[model samples]
Target: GSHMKNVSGSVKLWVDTTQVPYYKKIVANFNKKYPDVKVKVTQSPNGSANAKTDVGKDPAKAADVFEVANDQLGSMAEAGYINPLSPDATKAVKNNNVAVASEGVTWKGKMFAYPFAEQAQTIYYNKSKLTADDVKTWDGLTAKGVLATDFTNAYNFYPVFLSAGTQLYGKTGETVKGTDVNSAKGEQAMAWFAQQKSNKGVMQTSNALNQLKSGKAAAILDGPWNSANIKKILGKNFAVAPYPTIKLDGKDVQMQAFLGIETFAVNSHASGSNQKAAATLASFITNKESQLIVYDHSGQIPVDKTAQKSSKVASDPVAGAVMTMAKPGNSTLMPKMPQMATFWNDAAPLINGAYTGSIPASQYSTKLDTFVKNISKA
Candidate 1:
């Protein structure tokens, strides 16, 4: 209704399977507004690691516009798989400046994508079960039997482990810290986890989904990705909070939650007017109105500060509680160098082995550190 030209062309968009339904609504609305451009949607059921498919496939089958996580954004850009939207496309909104939006979206200083949803890990607790006093520090939870569960996934476990003053990955995407897995903080974090397994009454570590669902867990450290499902399960009973701090060397060591953004990148292969239309659509999907629609359903908060403040999409307590961590200062993009790929895939098992006790924590860190170093050289 705003504007339409006889620009008869079809644009194919690839999006994560989980986001297909959400994108479908946006695409339908977009086409309704710009009928001249035909849009086709395909579900690119790729996880954080398998997104290489669309980048290598047929053009028609190739994703002109696609959804990518912040960690993988750099790799995608380095591979020359995406194109920067002309500056014109980013001009429509307030704070159209895409600086924060470009953290993972840029490659070699050129912008590659427009970020829409930035997800960060936040601490969730059942207020009735544990008081704020009980979780003042990482050690307090364990000492007081505050949470009904052990830390959840491979990723969530690291933030608390690191908060207690252990270093996991060294300095955001370079190396996994802890040359000595049995380092003071490493052992402390692991011993805490091991103790949880033994203390059946105080700690639980099964499926966090079911744990929260059945109310078997008192507190969990998780992100907004599952907030929709969590709210549906726990309803008004649960509350989301920032991670606790532990003191290291008489200074407060704040817990660091992993940060990731979901963004839309245009394919460089999409040249000419089709490319223009694709970039236009990419910008449109991330525009104020469209971003709110996605955020409302996905539980992923918007990257646009203006939209976050103005749009009532995610006014719920859980989303409201996470605003602090979502700011540009708190969030860090996961490194996307192709070399880092091996760390997430190949090195993940080493850490997993350590967690499960197959490998001694000491041996685990030694092997993990070596493996990451060796892989980077290769």
Candidate 2:
């Protein structure tokens, strides 16, 4: 408790609105031990997007401690806007959190952020509409009725490609050597996503949870973020599980979701005592106790192993299912290389085109090939 006694300085912290209340409590607790240090909590409207942008532009004006998505670690680290974790902070993350969580916050072999929570897509369904067995495969679910999801968004649709064994890039040190979205497996994945619209009645809409709640669809492919609302609407009927298996090349493949970690990164502008204070605050907030606070208050899956094993997490349906899918052996971490900067924009149109029938299934391979070429130029 007296560890932070010598570290006394005001530190501005930015976090998403959903995390604001819990962070306030955390700040109060931190003050109890280190009352001399002042902490200000500010809510970021765009979550970590503004934090990443502003810090990259001018670190002096950025928050001393800010929460950012794992995907931004590479760019933030490359820009020298964020500080690498001190040896002690790194040990806390590696020892307390799951292995995959550490991988998400690392860039070019250095830990650049404090891992807080982990996330991956899963099937949210009404138990009455589909049993656990019924959700084992996409073919089974489609046979029941329309499977609602936002196919237009590449993030929501990338699982299909991953399940089919497509590699977004060939890794080389801190950079990507090349992208393989045009490979044979990629073509099969793209074709399968395209066929879903006509063959399985895959509706292209953002209101997937709304559709599920109103009985318009049997299930939706989404992450834990929607669990609270779904639970409120369905009551005992709400259920969650790993994403269904989709058929590819005459074989069944479990949908491999792009996993992400929620993390805290310190600004490089804060030096000496401010830097130590920021690191201490980050470690304090992401510790087992505070991670449990996050799980209890926001329903997000905690990355801490001890927190994940707690009854509060183990007994909760949504958290349990997410933990299963996000285990290191079961999930793929979102790429942390700077080459991923252009991936979303370059892949979106191609996926949307295939889903909307703008690009015929017959042309899926060629379009993907073109996308790969365009991404290479970036």
Candidate 3:
């Protein structure tokens, strides 16, 4: 098939070390479409997980196109390490992918990357212990079995506030003064966190999978990265589902997750001639065909609308559950604000204290106010 045949230029690509092989395979197909564009694929120096710091080391020396998670887009784009996609590329991204997929990679109204995968934590459980219907609510799951998770990981637990009816970084996650968790809603979330301490079915663990395998915990809340290991451990008994509803403020509300998208971004420093070529390569690798390749090799869930509908993806329980949780009511797209650095740092311990009662219940309002002040405002 013809691709960007005339977008001819040399471009360097970087992905995680283990991803180099598959990325090279994807690049091979990309070359078929744009044979005139010289391409090189290699593992990133510090890996895409650390794309911000690694690329910041010296963007001039970095790959022309590289991998990154959505949260880092703001900092990377602000630093001028990456640039907005061309008009056609940007429009195609918005039109071809899930609405949130485009929103996740956009910074300051411009799309900054081609999102390939999405992640949201769901319940991975031992089917032998809990039936599918039993895992639909926190009280139901815990009434029959134990749930192992950490209250300290903000990525895992901060959304509790969101579930309790608070907005972080506004609904779209772009507002500078958008966080408003220092209210009655936030305290309600804190109350539930405290209540968990006394639940016989809920247990705190840094390694929930080990607890799951040991048979001490019937289920664990986790993202798709651990799906393979979970499947291995559960075997025939494995089952996956979106987060169960938790009763709070006398009503059951769907527990929310932080939706995360993994993307391939174009470097602004690739020089004039190579910039479009880099954008072309980035877009190519995240297209439907390439996204399926990624899902087959890795368990990463695709964000492309059509990719998500493919029989290969549609049939997978893990993918289905995560995709369900990726919806608006089930999850919140983590904000890309540079202040999010502060959010991650301060959120953990605050939530931790609430769960452990280290911070008094009477003090939740004051503590939340301080947290909001630290993580938001210009």
What are the per-model C-alpha RMSD values against the true structure?
A: 4.4, 2.5, 2.6
lDDT of 1: 0.62
lDDT of 1 at 3: 64
Best by the TM-score measure = 2
For lDDT, candidate 2 versus 3, the one ahead is 3
Question: What local lDDT does model 2 show for residue 366?
Answer: 84
Residue-wise lDDT of candidate 2 within 270-291, one digit each (tens)?
6556887888788888888888
How many pairs of residues in model 2 come into backbone collision? 0
Mind giving the per-residue lDDT tens digits that candidate 3 earns over 47-113? 7668988888887888999999899889888888887888999999898899988989888899988
On the 0 to 100 scale, the lDDT of residue 93 in model 2 is 88
lDDT of each: 0.62, 0.78, 0.89
User: TM-score rank, highest first?
Assistant: 2, 3, 1
Candidate 1: how many backbone clashes?
2
Q: Which ten residues in a row have the lowest lDDT in candidate 2?
A: 169-178
Query: What TM-score number comes out for model 1?
Result: 0.79
Clashing pairs in 3: none
lDDT of candidate 1 over 34-103, digit per residue (tens): 7777778787756433565556555345667877776666666667676555665544432553354665
TM-score of each: 0.79, 0.92, 0.91
